[PDB]
Amino acid sequence: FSEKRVELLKELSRKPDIYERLASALAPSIYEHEDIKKGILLQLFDPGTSKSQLLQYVYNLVPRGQYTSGKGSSAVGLTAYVMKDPETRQLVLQTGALVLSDNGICCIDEFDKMNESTRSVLHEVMEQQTLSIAKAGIICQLNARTSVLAAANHTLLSRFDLIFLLLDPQDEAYDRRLAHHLVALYLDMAVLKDYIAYAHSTIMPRLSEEASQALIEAYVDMRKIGSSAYPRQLESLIRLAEAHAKVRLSNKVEAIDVEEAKRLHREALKQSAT
Amino acid sequence: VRDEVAEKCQKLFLDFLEEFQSSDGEIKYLQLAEELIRPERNTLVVSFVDLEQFNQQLSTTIQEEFYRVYPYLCRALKTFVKDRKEIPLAKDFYVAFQDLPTRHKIRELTSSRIGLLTRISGQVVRTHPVHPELVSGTFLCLDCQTVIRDVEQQFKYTQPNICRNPVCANRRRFLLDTNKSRFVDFQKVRIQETQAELPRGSIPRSLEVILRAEAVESAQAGDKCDFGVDGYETEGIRGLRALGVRDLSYRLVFLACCNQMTVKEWEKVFEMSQDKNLYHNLCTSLFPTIHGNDEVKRGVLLMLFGGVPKTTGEGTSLRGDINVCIVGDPSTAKSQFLKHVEEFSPRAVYTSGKASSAAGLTAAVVRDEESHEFVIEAGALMLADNGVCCIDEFDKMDVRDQVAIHEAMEQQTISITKAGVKATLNARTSILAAANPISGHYDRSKSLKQNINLSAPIMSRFDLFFILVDECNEVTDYAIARRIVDLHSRIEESIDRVYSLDDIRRYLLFARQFKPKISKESEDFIVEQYKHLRQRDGSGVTKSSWRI
Amino acid sequence: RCSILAAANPAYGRYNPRRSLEQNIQLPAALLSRFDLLWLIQDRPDRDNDLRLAQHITYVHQHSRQPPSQFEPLDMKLMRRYIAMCREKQPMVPESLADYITAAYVEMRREAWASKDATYTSARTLLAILRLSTALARLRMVDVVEKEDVNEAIRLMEMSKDSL
Secondary structure: OHHHHHHHHHHHHHOOOHHHHHHHHOOOOOOOOOHHHHHHHHHHOOOOOOOOOHHHHHHHHOOOOOOEOOOOOOHHHOOOOOEEEOOOOEEEOOOOHHHHOOOOOOOEOOHHHOOOOOOHHHHHHHHHOEEEEEOOOOEEEEEOOOOOOOOOOOOOHHHOOOOOOOOOOOOOHHHHHHHHHHHHHOOHHHHHHHHHHHHHHHOOOOOOOOOOOOOHHHHHHHOOOOOOOOOOHHHHHHHHOHHHHHHHHOOOOOOOOOOHHHHHHHHHHHOOOO | OHHHHHHHHHHHHHHHHOOOOOOOOOHHHHHHHHHHHOOOOOOOOOOHHHHHHHHHHHHHHHHHOHHHHHHHHHHHHHHHOOOOOOOOOOOOOOOOOOOOOOOOOOOOOOHHHOOOOOOOOOEOOOOOOOOOOOOOOOOOOOOOOOOOOOOOOOOOOOOOOOOOOOOOOOOOOOOOOOOOOOOOOOEEEOOEOOOOOOOOOOOOOOOOEEEOOOOOOOOOOOOOOOOOOOOOOOOOOOOOOOOOOOOOOOOOOOOOOOOHHHHHHHHHHHHHHOOOOHHHHHHHHHOOOOOOOHHHHHHHHHHHOOOOOOOOOOOOOOOOOOEEOOOOOOOOOOOOHHHHHHOOOOOOOEOOOOOOOOOOOOOOOOOOOOOOOOOOOOHHHHOOOOOEEEOOOOOOOOOHHHHHHHHHHHHOOOOOEOOOOEOOOOOOOEEEOOOOOOOOOOOOOOOOOOOOOOOHHHHOOOOEOOOOOOOOOHHHHOOHHHHHHHOOOOOOOOOOOOOOOOHHHHHHHHOOOOOOOOOHHHHHHHHHHHHHHHHHHOOOOOOOOOOO | OOOOOOOOOOOOOOOOOOOOOOOOOOOOHHHHHOOOOOOOOOOOOOHHHHHHHHHHHHHOOOOOOOOOOOOOOOOHHHHHHHHHHHHOOOOOOOOOHHHHHHHHHHHHHHHHHHHOOOOOOOOHHHHHHHHHHHHHHHHOOOOOOOOHHHHHHHHHHHHHOOOO
């Protein structure tokens, strides 16, 4: 068991094509445009186009979670779900899914489908970095150290963490591979069982010195707009950087595989000007 | 054997009404009587050191039998007059002891600990109106039996089951013992545990505390006080009712009532206070993420300092709060991170802006036999007492927020009135707010109307104003991000903490009874100079807000 | 694990030819999009077809020759039993047949999208195609050469295609 897992990591050293193999083997049921897969990877450690099914992977892997949607789930489903016990005739301070969603991955569908009157509760959480409790007698905050991933279309556009646009490449050959993929398909268990738990037990990333100046290179190119560093995405960027530390077991992060995330935001950003 | 202890406690308290200290005689007793009767304030205290030296077991007897000493101390204590003349004049009152030196956490106050006492500590939530609800009495007809001097006591109804008259429901009756009854009051107050003493995820449990009329509004609501056989019938007669058991038995039932040490503290704190220019040290340490804008950071830093003059010459209410207006971002990549800096301050309560349940402003009757969804609490400011107020989403002042905020600003209280409730409070704390424009400061060529994007009645009362013009200066923006990443480099660069900086605030606490009596000569010199300040404003300086 | 059959009433009026979807019907199309098959019948004024019904409506319970194609009357119970023995055979679909159909799908996608009309398809079509072979390929017990199924599978889509 102990010696067997060790031989697994050393075996990849001989193979020179491990750079693409590790990404391709994990979550193969995800469609093309694998920039989402990288985003899923960061989170891991025509609506419903492989998107509703995407929620299955997280829900299957971590059983602790809940599904919610707009116009179909009321405000009681996340919080303020106070109700009486009919057998004992006494009030209960029920909570909801968001409250128990701390230390986990949050699954919310149809994020933009919420009305303008509602959606109030998340707006504070995304801007207060915590989940506050609004009850009868008790006002407090539960830590909400998690991330939000979705896709959608008064100066409050800043609330969203990530915005993506899906374009049609007008390529049928992309569809062909998935069609064959279902028929064609019809060691991994050990990775899911012990590797995930054991690494999370004591392994704790540390911020090295070499990655400090790397963030500086981001806003330098950005100085051309209006003629940056005031956007808080820089702070968000280093947050995600902890993912690169898990890969290749390197505690330092370089510009490679980090500048690529900038283009993902640039594509969605550029279409907003004309 | 309750009788002997019930007599001896009364004896050892009554003979104690004369002190050996404070001269001798009835002078102190006369002063206590004057303070009790003439203003009807009903405030008395007993020194526990003398109590213990006399009979330390006395504090233990009361501690283990408050439930037994309440009813006898209710009546026999009336004998302070030592004359039959004054006993009919006074109808009823209550006094007690104060400054109890042993306390326990509220959450741990288990039912296994009934009979103790603790400090009334926390914030009032879900206030309740005063009622003289049922206490003791009888329902039986006088023609069948006379009123007994031992019945009910608790909220339950009559225990005796003699003269089975009211068992049938086909009879209306209203004979109420209104002439001879002990109807006064009992009120539920949902006191919440102190958050500071509580950890992050707490969800406090609010006890069932009952406060007497004398306890009604005796302090500022929402705050801690910090200064043969017949009929051939055999045994087995059934007929018990279960309707009166699920209500009170399921809740907690108790009653509530409202030197080298200083020198050692004075030595360490006062000497270190002599360090000059500590505020300069704060700017780098307390504001790690500011570049330039030395005047902007200064106003906030000074805003931390307190000191509000009260009304001692019986004049008008001076306003002492601080309302600061900051010009900043065009509301894009909000500098609102500065709010997070405010979080680094103890002995304060952190407002979560305005997006909340908002239990106030839609208050309604709270007696729906178990509870009400809405509670009687304008926490929008009340919760922010004795701390800092932070309002986010300030663009949410369309209708409901506008009315509330001005009234709070104007009177420093909230007069909630729903035809059943009407009261005023004292919310002495700063209000920290910042509003962002649509896209920036451009009134040079564009009309100010509809441009500044604020509301007049709120912006007008703001104490301070600023002018912040942002320019695309690459010279300073280049090194802006260098300091930002420095926050994560604690290993090689950290400011060593030698002493706590919070001691300064506790200095202002003693300042309340002390009088500063600032000299008038220093004061007016600025005032005379201030005339030049207002005159130069009208000579053609750049305009930002016509308030001056 | 059952099969859900849905019948939808038209919302306070008949389908509007002038108005396309997403405007004439208030319910979001995405909710209806999840459905694999959608069917609507427009009652066109085809007088010739309408002639048949009046004669056809009489025949039921008018005579004993209900299966007009000289089918022996039989016992009504036995008709169900004939179906059961067919299900017990458990034939096998051809796997190689998938690749040939795949080549056909390439053309089908392009023409469907390029129309940009109200009717449109997506990857959900892929489920339908494989599902089509479920009943079609079991019926033919040949196990030597399979060719006709490709056109038979298509012909089922053609009626579904442009159904409006």
